[PDB]
Design a protein around this ligand. Structure first.
Ligand SMILES: O=C(O)c1ccc(Cn2ccnc2)o1
Length: 307
């Protein structure tokens, strides 16, 4: 059962990026953390001991997001250079450069099969790409302002997208056509979305200090999580599932917030960063959180809980 609270404590601080960190993600096999930054670099770190492993270079401008393939062997990154790059993590080599967006690429993810990448851009489109060939399969005219997040569900058949236009939409992967507009407001911006692990729910952030858990099928809000600060940045949120069932997010008051998913109560706030916590990630098997901060800080912190 979910305990009353976790007890995340700081274990490591990872320095090396020279501008704001933009995203952190654990590999599915649990071995690694990948980070991206405005400094144009991807860094790989040991997930359990924080040990710096390597830098992956090649983008010409800053990177906003990085994501792992299901087998932990590839990464995709989204850059202000208007491209995505697919990387072989072991060799550090760029396998493909995905060209087609006409402005910054902000968000990216692989499908579970890891044969497709989805991307979202400041150009207001969502693109779907073939991993093996690097070909753009589809361009969806998804939004009327920059796309803040894109994510596939557990069987790969759906993509959820969000935007500063205020919308959250769900797309059929195979045809590219819209299944549903889940959130149909013109304000506030929807700054982050993702499916829950079982695919039944969508976690959505809006730039009014609010996270919400939605039932995809019914199109209804089930839970709202508040108390943090989020009016400007596209801050990631996570489902923590290895121990207690939490929602995790960074915040513009430099804290990591952790809520009980069911009761909506704040159960812990992690203090230590000295700038906005833009990204958090939850380890796939251990009760470990990674957090990363903007340019007054530029570090990643690894935190561990007993539950
Ligand atoms: O300007 C922002 O909002 C900003 C910079 C970096 C991030 C975090 N992020 C990246 C992709 N999805 C979320 O957000």
């Amino acid at each position: 059962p979910t305990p009353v609270k976790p007890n995340y404590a700081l274990k490591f601080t990872l320095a090396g990026h020279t501008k704001a960190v933009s995203s952190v993600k654990f590999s599915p096999n649990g071995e690694w953390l990948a980070s991206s930054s405005a400094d144009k670099l991807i860094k790989i770190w040991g997930a359990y001991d924080g040990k710096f492993e390597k830098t992956i270079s090649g983008h010409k401008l800053g990177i906003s997001d990085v994501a792992w393939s299901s087998d932990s062997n590839l990464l995709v990154s989204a850059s202000d250079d208007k491209t995505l790059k697919i990387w072989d993590v072991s060799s550090g080599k760029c396998l493909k450069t995905l060209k087609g967006h006409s402005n910054y690429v902000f968000c990216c993810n692989f499908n579970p099969q890891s044969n497709l990448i989805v991307s979202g851009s400041f150009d207001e489109s969502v693109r779907i790409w073939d991993v093996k060939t690097g070909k753009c399969l589809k361009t969806l005219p998804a939004h009327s302002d920059p796309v803040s997040a894109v994510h596939f569900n557990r069987d790969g058949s759906l993509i959820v997208s969000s935007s500063y236009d205020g919308l959250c939409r769900i797309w059929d992967t195979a045809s590219g056509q819209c299944l549903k507009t889940l959130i149909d407001d013109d304000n506030p911006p929807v700054s982050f979305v993702k499916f829950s692990p079982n695919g039944k729910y969508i976690l959505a952030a809006t730039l009014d200090n609010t996270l919400k858990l939605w039932d995809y099928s019914k199109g209804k809000c089930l839970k709202t999580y508040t108390g943090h600060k989020n009016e400007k940045y596209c801050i990631f949120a996570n489902f923590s599932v290895t121990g207690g069932k939490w929602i995790v997010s960074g915040s513009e008051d430099n804290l990591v917030y952790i809520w009980n998913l069911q009761t909506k109560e704040i159960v812990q706030k992690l203090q230590g960063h000295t700038d906005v916590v833009i990204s958090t990630a939850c380890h796939p098997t251990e009760n470990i959180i990674a957090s990363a901060a903007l340019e007054n800080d530029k570090t990643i912190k690894l935190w561990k809980s007993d539950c």
